[PDB]
A paper describes a structure:
Two protein families are involved in this signaling pathway: the ER-localized stromal interaction molecule (STIM) calcium sensors and the calcium-release activated calcium (CRAC) channels (consisting of Orai family proteins), which are located in the plasma membrane. Next, the STIM1 oligomers rapidly migrate to ER-plasma membrane junctions, where they activate CRAC channels by directly binding to Orai1. Our recent study demonstrated that the inhibitory helix (amino acids 310-337, referred to as IH), which is close to the SOAR dimer, tightly binds to SOAR to prevent its exposure, thus keeping STIM1-Ccyto in an inactive resting state.
The structure of CC1-IH-mut was determined using the single-wavelength anomalous dispersion (SAD) method. As a result, all the tails of the CC1-IH-mut structure are clustered together, whereas the four heads are spread out. The two monomers paired to form the CC1-IH dimer in an antiparallel manner, with a buried surface area of 1,114.5 Å2 as calculated by AREAIMOL in the structure of CC1-IH-mut. These interactions mainly take place between the IH of one CC1-IH fragment and a region preceding IH in the other CC1-IH fragment. Our current study revealed that CC1-IH exists as a long helix and that the oligomerization of CC1-IH depends on the IH domain.
Numbering used by the authors:
A (entry chain D), B (entry chain A): 248 to 336
Write the structure that this text describes.
């Protein structure tokens, strides 16, 4: 009698705990799962975008420099072509 | 790069947690689920046994009182046959 009543309170107890944990692994443990994805996707998106930025900055740099060198040659062309024409008064 | 490395720990830390929960869920929540059931079983088994003990002690008690009223009646017979026979001596 006395022995029972007591243990019962520990059952209706235990039973609510297991039900809160069943409330958590479906409300709490889901905000954390949605979030983990958001975070992981944002991070990977950024890592990949910095690899773009970088690779792009590099590409136009090459192009600039190629164009510069072509221009320094067109300078030489200009001067020498003018010396030719001039010499033929 | 600075602000990334930072949140990367954040994503690693949140990832460890989310892995515990899916393990405690599947090994500790499930251990408390066994125990709730056995506690519930034992509690119920004891209630039915108490009722069954009550039902039987009661049965015994009329099977006993009915048969004590009989022994008294048979006693009266014993005495009435005694006097009848005695008076035809």
């Amino acid at each position: 009698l006395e022995g029972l009543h007591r243990a019962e309170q520990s059952l209706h107890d235990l039973q609510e705990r297991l039900h809160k944990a069943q409330e958590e692994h479906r409300t709490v443990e889901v905000e954390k799962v949605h979030l983990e994805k958001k975070l992981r996707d944002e991070i990977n998106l950024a890592k990949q975008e910095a690899q773009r930025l970088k690779e792009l900055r590099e590409g136009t740099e090459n192009e600039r420099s190629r164009q510069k060198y072509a221009e320094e040659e067109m300078e030489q062309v200009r001067e020498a072509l003018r010396k030719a024409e001039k010499e033929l008064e």
